[PDB]
Amino acid sequence: HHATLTVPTTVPSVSEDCEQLRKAFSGWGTNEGLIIDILGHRNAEQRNLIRKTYAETYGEDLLKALDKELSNDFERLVLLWALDPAERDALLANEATKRWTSSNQVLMEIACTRSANQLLHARQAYHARYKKSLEEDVAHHTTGDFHKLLLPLVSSYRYEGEEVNMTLAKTEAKLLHEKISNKAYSDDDVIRVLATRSKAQINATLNHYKNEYGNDINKDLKADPKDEFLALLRSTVKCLVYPEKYFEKVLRLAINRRGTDEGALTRVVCTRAEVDLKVIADEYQRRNSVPLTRAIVKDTHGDYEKLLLVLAGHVEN
Ligand SMILES: [Ca+2]
Ligand SMILES: [Ca+2]
Ligand SMILES: [Ca+2]
Numbered sequence: 001h002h003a004t005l006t007v008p009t010t011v012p013s014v015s016e017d018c019e020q021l022r023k024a025f026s027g028w029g030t031n032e033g034l035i036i037d038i039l040g041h042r043n044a045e046q047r048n049l050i051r052k053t054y055a056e057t058y059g060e061d062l063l064k065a066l067d068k069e070l071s072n073d074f075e076r077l078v079l080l081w082a083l084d085p086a087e088r089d090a091l092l093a094n095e096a097t098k099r100w101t102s103s104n105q106v107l108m109e110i111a112c113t114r115s116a117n118q119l120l121h122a123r124q125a126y127h128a129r130y131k132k133s134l135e136e137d138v139a140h141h142t143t144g145d146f147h148k149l150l151l152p153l154v155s156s157y158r159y160e161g162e163e164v165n166m167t168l169a170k171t172e173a174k175l176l177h178e179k180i181s182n183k184a185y186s187d188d189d190v191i192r193v194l195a196t197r198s199k200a201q202i203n204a205t206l207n208h209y210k211n212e213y214g215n216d217i218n219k220d221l222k223a224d225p226k227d228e229f230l231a232l233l234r235s236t237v238k239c240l241v242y243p244e245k246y247f248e249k250v251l252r253l254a255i256n257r258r259g260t261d262e263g264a265l266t267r268v269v270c271t272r273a274e275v276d277l278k279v280i281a282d283e284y285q286r287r288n289s290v291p292l293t294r295a296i297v298k299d300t301h302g303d304y305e306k307l308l309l310v311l312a313g314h315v316e317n
Contacts, residue, residue: 004277004313005217006094007041014053017042021050022058024103030069031302035078040310044084044274051082073262074303080270081311088271089114089122091136093154095143106267107138108232111153112239113246118158145186145229149236159198169204170212172197176205179215180220183228195237202240209287247272248283251292263306281312 012020018039024031024038040094042050054062066078080088089110096106111119126134138154139147172193179187192203210216218234238246248269254264272280281292288295 002276002279004273004281004311005041005043006313006315007043007046013043014046015259016059017046018048018054018057021054021062025065025069031212032070032074033306035066036303036307036310039078039082040307041201045115047082048084072304073266074307077263077266077270077304077307077311080266081307084125085118085271085274086125089118090125090129090134092267092271093122093126094130097137102141104142104228105235106151106218107142107234108151108247109239111150111156112236113243116158117152117154120157124133146232147230148241149191149195149229149232152191153236156195158196162200162286163198164200164204166208169201170208172205173208173212176209177220178215179243180217183223184234185221190233194233194240199240203290206237206241209227229307244279244283247280248287251284251295251310255295255299256288262300262304265296265300269308269311277312 020034020038024034027184039047039050044312054060054065063079065083066082067075070078080091083091092106093110094145096103096110110122113250114122126132131136133154135151139151142150174188175189176193179185179190184190193202197205206217213220218237220236221230221234222232240247250268254261254268268280269277271300284290284292284295290298293309293312293314295304296312300308
């Protein structure tokens with residue numbers, strides 16, 4: 001497995017974990033380390049059960065307690081992390097259509113780097129929490145080419161088999177090339193292949209594209225380096241068939257800079273820690289000659305750092 005999360009061989013009982021978290025909230029302040037020690041080491045089912053039990057036993061919402069009890073980047077990380085991945089994606093996707101917070105890239109990212117069922121599960125969480133559809137928010141909030149691409153992206157329920165059709169791949173490779181060549185970046189056919197074909201079939205298409213034209217599709221999506229739509233296309237491509245190169249680069253820009261973009265760092269670590277963060281981290285090393293964990297040591301502080309690290313696979317020390 002490519003997951004970075006570590007879970008004890010022996011998991012304590014749900015009431016053991018629940019009373020320990022209770023204790024962590026007692027007094028003026030909180031024992032962040034104890035929180036990190038528990039939540040940072042439970043899978044989604046475990047966390048779900050913990051939340052369900054915490055509510056039944058103590059009569060309060062754990063996430064409400066976590067919110068009141070903490071602050072800033074550490075609070076955002078913990079809450080984001082604590083959620084079920086479907087709830088987490090719903091929340092993130094929701095933020096990405098609103099005013100202060102809004103992000104095309106994030107919507108693209110959720111749509112393209114999730115499996116079909118993970119995306120569906122997000123959409124169901126989205127219904128439960130927000131009493132609307134992700135599609136209707138996305139459709140309401142985006143315009144132009146962004147609208148044209150993102151509405152089908154977040155709407156997809158892709159076929160997930162490994163079957164590839166090579167004739168089709170070859171045909172659709174030239175279609176893509178023809179349309180891109182004529183600057184018709186948002187043509188039905190471009191949108192269609194990226195939003196509807198399986199990830200295996202798109203990969204095959206881009207392979208034929210390269211064989212046939214001698215460079216990969218992103219090289220031809222650079223005519224205007226300023227253009228935000230091209231950047232979204234190039235990102236869509238990467239997310240669909242090279243997700244770990246996408247995420248490496250998100251981390252790289254978040255960290256290798258005079259800041260940290262803590263939002264991007266938090267999003268990547270908390271959404272991928274249960275999926276493929278190990279693979280992203282290897283890609284980070286390859287591409288930056290520093291381990292990810294070390295790069296985060298380096299750019300982050302305190303409990304934020306400490307959880308980032310724990311989520312990124314750090315044991316003990
Ligand atoms: Ca307290
Ligand atoms: Ca930095
Ligand atoms: Ca540090």
